[PDB]
Design a protein around this ligand. Structure first.
Ligand SMILES: COC(=O)[C@H](Cc1cccc(C(=N)N)c1)NC(=O)CNS(=O)(=O)c1ccc(C)cc1
Ligand SMILES: [Ca+2]
Length: 223
């Protein structure tokens, strides 16, 4: 996260860190047994880390639980990131508590201008690299498709939305992928892609979760 702020320990209790020997992507707890993340974060041997703040220090509220099954969206396209969403089932249910908690799924989508909270342990520099230990947060509005497309010349689909600031300076970044975009109390986005970080006219692109709630619910019910 570039241009954001230190969340404060466990203030985003639905934020998880996906770990394969090191943090590599974020995710969001949906119930005691399931995490949602980005399909492009798929890999084998994932350990889900819940209740994290400093990802390099055991602070006492962590739960580490191995993934038992991963399900990449049926229509995920790795070239365009269309349908960049994946579900991860935990080998055992998380112990839910004030620091380890699920985030509500949307019952309707979010409109342009809606403010959201984006969070993660990704790069905090727009030029070069610095990776934080503690969770970072950023407040950012959803942009209209037309403004975003004309400003960025990105190719996006109806399963994506843009969020951030066209002036640059505030954006998600490398290492934030898979993590949450929460707007008015609902998980509306997953950190997906962009170009660079926090550059002028190159806002962040996010998986539009409200398009997937039926698939999420039926997938969980059946697995
Ligand atoms: C490749 O250069 C980067 O550092 C950024 C990191 C990143 C990751 C996620 C979000 C942001 C952001 N600023 N909101 C930045 N990656 C990318 O920007 C994209 N990775 S990418 O190059 O793999 C890629 C590019 C384009 C498509 C359609 C799919 C995948
Ligand atoms: Ca920790």
């Amino acid at each position: 996260i570039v241009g954001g702020y230190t969340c404060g320990a466990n203030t985003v209790p639905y934020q998880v860190s996906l770990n394969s020997g090191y943090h590599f992507c974020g995710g969001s707890l949906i119930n005691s047994q399931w995490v949602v993340s980005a399909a492009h974060c798929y890999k084998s041997g994932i350990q889900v880390r819940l209740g994290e703040d400093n990802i390099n220090v055991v602070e006492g509220n962590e739960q580490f639980i191995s993934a038992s099954k991963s399900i990449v969206h049926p229509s995920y396209n790795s070239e365009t990131y269309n349908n960049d969403i994946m579900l991860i089932k935990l080998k055992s249910a998380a112990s839910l508590n004030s620091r380890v908690a699920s985030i509500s799924l949307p019952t309707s989508c979010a409109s342009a201008g809606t403010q959201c909270l984006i969070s993660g342990w990704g790069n905090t520099k727009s030029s070069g690299t610095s990776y934080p230990d503690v969770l970072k947060c950023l407040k950012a509005p959803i942009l209209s498709d037309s403004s975003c497309k004309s400003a960025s010349s990105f190719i996006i689909t109806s399963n994506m939305f843009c969020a951030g600031y066209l002036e640059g300076g505030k954006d998600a970044c490398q290492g934030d992928s898979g993590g949450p975009v929460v707007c008015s109390g609902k998980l509306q986005g997953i950190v997906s892609w962009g170009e660079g970080c926090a550059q002028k006219n190159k806002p962040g692109i996010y998986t539009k979760v409200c398009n997937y709630v039926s698939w999420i619910k039926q997938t969980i019910a059946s697995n």
